[PDB]
Amino acid sequence: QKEMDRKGLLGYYFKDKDFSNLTMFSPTRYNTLIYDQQTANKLLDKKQQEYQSIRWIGLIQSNKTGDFTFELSDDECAIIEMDGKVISNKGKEKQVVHLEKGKLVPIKIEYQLDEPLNIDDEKFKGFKLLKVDNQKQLHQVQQDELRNPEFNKKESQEFLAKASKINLFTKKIKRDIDEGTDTDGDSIPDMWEENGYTIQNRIAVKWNDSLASKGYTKFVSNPLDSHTVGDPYTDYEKASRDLDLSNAKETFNPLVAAFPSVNVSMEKVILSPNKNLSNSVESHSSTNWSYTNTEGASVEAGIGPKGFSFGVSANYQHSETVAQEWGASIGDTTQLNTASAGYLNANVRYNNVGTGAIYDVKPTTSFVLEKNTIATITAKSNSTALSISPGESYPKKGQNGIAITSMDDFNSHPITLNKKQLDQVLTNNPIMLETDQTDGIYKIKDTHGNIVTGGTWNGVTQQIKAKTASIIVDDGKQVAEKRVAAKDYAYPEDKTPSLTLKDALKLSFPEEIKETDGLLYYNNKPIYESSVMTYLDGNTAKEVKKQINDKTGEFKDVQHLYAVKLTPKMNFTIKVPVAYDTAKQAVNLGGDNPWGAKGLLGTWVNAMVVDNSGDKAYKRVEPGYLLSPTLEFSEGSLDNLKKNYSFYVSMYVKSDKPFTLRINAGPYSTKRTIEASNDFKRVDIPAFYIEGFPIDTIRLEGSDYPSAIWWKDVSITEVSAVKK
């Protein structure tokens, strides 16, 4: 789309004579009182661009100090209000107004026609605003003399809201909401915000299904709030893209907040017994973005009739908190294992894992090991403040991180660890990095349309949190956090549009998430509910169970986690699978009498895939005696599993008798007794990959003959590094 200035006025073009049925609104194009026809003609057939009333609204400044009267080119049907005063009324009652050069004052111009006029009529193209000086010398008011309303100012919202409820001709306040009313003064009529609108090159129209095929986005927003998600930008500034285009493109939707999230990660982590770092041990270190949300979580299962499950953290934290895990040593640890102190060095990297651009920030970071602070980065290490775009890092990806020993807080020294602490790091107790971003700023537009600093992110963080739910997606390589519009269903005057968790994933990940055959994929990997492991806080767990358990009211059709209607301060962490097996991509071995099934992870011995009218699942083979289905992992199928890591192996299962689910990894094997179910239910079993003890098989060991076992949607998701 065009990057447009805030010059000219904002034009409202109505079908009816009484400013009640708005057809389109747009800023006015250079030295005219009309709009861009190339864009308008794509949004609305030329034949429907015929209007019986027009309002132009915004600000005027004179290019010279003086005493002026005003007129429209067709003056007998125009009324002009300036600074709340009627200064011309159908060509009569002209007031002389003193205007100081460069001083913007509110202006509202209204025009009524006795029959509809097409925008392409001579008269429409001819409309101008004229300024008459003390000599009765006539001047067209120039584009640089005009500005749009200052959308983010309360006084401008009051001016727009008032203009939507009355007009200068009849002077009778509207008794009820119509298709012109703009209660919150964000420029977009209440009924458009509820029922749908689109904007292209700052031309806004009501939604029509003919706009879907042309690829336009249907926006909805809260008609009672100029900032539906509480971020620095109005609903209109977001939908119109009239904001810092460094913000992520998902934020050009009123229902997705612009919100930075700055964290710090560590790379090239070493330990030495020597202060000078000679004879350092290197590491297979890992960053665990969502550690506190997963490690030690409790699993709640058997949720609703579809029997889904989720994890619950007692220590839920957002994406500014990161865990650093040593992973494993590289090199001779003989010396380090006898030492009374160790010395840690690393490179650090700042990551903006949110959707909002942040400028001039000097983040503070604590480094905490088993509740003890071992280091702090203060403003002192970033005398040159940072500016980081969403999804980017400083230093940028492909550049080395910053050595801790080079940063001013560290005085050219590594991090000292006492003997106990050195053992804690080597045994995969995490170093927690918690980062704060309280001086970082965002950019806005001032009354003349200039880019200025708008304020600190700290100043908008409360309102964003109060109006949104948080979604964190962690694929074990990077993390991303989104804040999306949420609704309090207990408060009917909260007119925020309803959004599900699935709808929110689609809106907030426009590049990474696609929907294929009704299921979401994240960078071509599964992110559908049966494939992922989702972690909640206690509040969110209670809210989800309430919606599932409601069979009759607002939530009667909520039966799955991804169908949950978002409520304020809900928190979700989604772990994307590192391996998965779907019966939809499996083939039977043995032709007419199958004995096994080959899928994405390997061969299920003593299983076959069954198609029931398009619905595929695995079933245990039934030759007349008990067998145990056994997944023989193929060479390479578990190459994505981190060493010295814990996981969940999850699947949906149904059996008429109990069975034992076994993960064989030698001395690190796990097992669970699974109760009989009438319906598929999700089961989640912990699994361990300890270096030297690969995961060899999954086995479903039955109890009882005769019986049946069916399963589908096997997934493996990361938890965290295994403590030694």
Q: Which residues bind Ca ion (CB under 5 A)?
A: 182, 184, 186, 188, 221-222, 235, 550, 555, 558
Q: Are the C-beta atoms of residues 609 and 597 closer than 8 Å to each other? A: yes
Shortest approach of Ca ion to residue 184 CB, angstroms?
A: 5
Measured from the CB atom, the residue of 238 and 349 that comes closer to Ca ion is 238
What distance in Å separates the CA atoms of residue 578 and residue 680, rounded to the nearest whole number? 23
Which lies closer to Ca ion via its Cβ, residue 229 or residue 716? 229
Q: Which is nearer to Ca ion, 238 or 483 (CB)?
A: 238
Toward Ca ion, which CB reaches closer, 359 or 555? 555
Of 81 and 182, which has the nearer Cβ to Ca ion? 182
Q: Which of 407, 272, 392, 409 is nearest to 331 (CA)?
A: 272
Place of tokens 């005057």: 493
Shortest distance in whole angstroms from residue 528 CB to Ca ion: 20
Nearest residue (CB) to Ca ion, 509 versus 555: 555
Q: Which is nearer to Ca ion, 254 or 356 (CB)?
A: 254
To Ca ion, the closest distance from the beta carbon of 229 in angstroms equals 10
Tokens 């010395």 — which residue? 343
Nearer to Ca ion, 75 or 150 (CB): 150
Rounded-to-integer distance, Cα 247 and Cα 179, Å: 32
Residue showing tokens 């804040």: 483
User: What whole-number distance in Å separates Cα of residue 580 and Cα of residue 526?
Assistant: 8
Cis peptide before 395 (omega within 30 of 0): yes
CB neighbour list of residue 509: distance below 8 Å, 6 or more residues apart = 250, 473, 480, 482, 522
Give the shortest CB-462-to-Ca ion separation in angstroms.
Answer: 19
Q: Check: CB of residue 564 under 8 Å from CB of residue 500.
A: yes
What does the H/E/C string look like for 129-143?
Answer: EEEECCCCCEEECCH
Handedness of CA 343, 349, 353, 355 (dihedral sign): positive
What contacts 203, CB < 8 A, 6 or more positions away? Answer: 24, 25, 26, 35, 36, 39, 40, 43
CB of 551 to Ca ion, least distance (A): 6
**Beta carbon of residue 206, minimum distance to Ca ion (angstroms, whole number):** 13
CB nearer Ca ion, residue 11 or residue 414 = 11
Q: How far apart are CA 171 and CA 37, in angstroms?
A: 32
What minimum distance in Å lies between the beta carbon of 654 and Ca ion? Answer: 22
Is the Cβ of residue 404 or residue 563 nearer to Ca ion in the bound state?
Answer: 563
Residue 374: half-sphere exposure toward Cβ, Cα within 13 Å: 26
Decide: 598 and 632 in contact? Cβ < 8 Å.
no
Cα pseudo-dihedral 315, 320, 326, 330, rounded to 10: 160
Q: Which is nearer to Ca ion, 221 or 265 (CB)?
A: 221
- Tokens of residue 395, six digits: 């230093």
Choose between 238 and 575: whose C-beta lies nearer to Ca ion: 238
Half-sphere exposure in the Cβ direction for 43 (13 Å, CA): 25
Asked if 361 and 439 count as a contact pair (C-beta separation under 8 A), the reply is: yes
Q: How far is the CB of 234 from Ca ion (least distance, A)?
A: 7
**Residue 304 CB, nearest distance to Ca ion (Å)?**
7
Q: Give the bridge partners for 654, in sequence order.
A: 710
Distance of closest approach, residue 390 Cβ to Ca ion, in angstroms: 23
For Ca ion, give the closer residue by CB, 558 or 607: 558
Give the nearest distance from C-beta 307 to Ca ion in angstroms.
14
Cβ–Cβ contacts within 10 Å for residue 525, how many?
Answer: 15
Q: Which amino acid is it at 303? A: I
User: Do 573 and 474 meet the contact criterion of CB atoms below 8 Å apart?
Assistant: yes
Shortest distance, CB of residue 173 to Ca ion, whole angstroms? 17
State in angstroms the smallest separation of the CB of 341 from Ca ion: 57
How many CA atoms lie less than 13 Å away from 420 in the CB half-sphere? Answer: 4
> And the tokens for 190?
């209440």
- Contact between 508 and 544 under an 8 Å Cβ cutoff? The reply is no
Q: The tokens of 362 are what? A: 């000097």
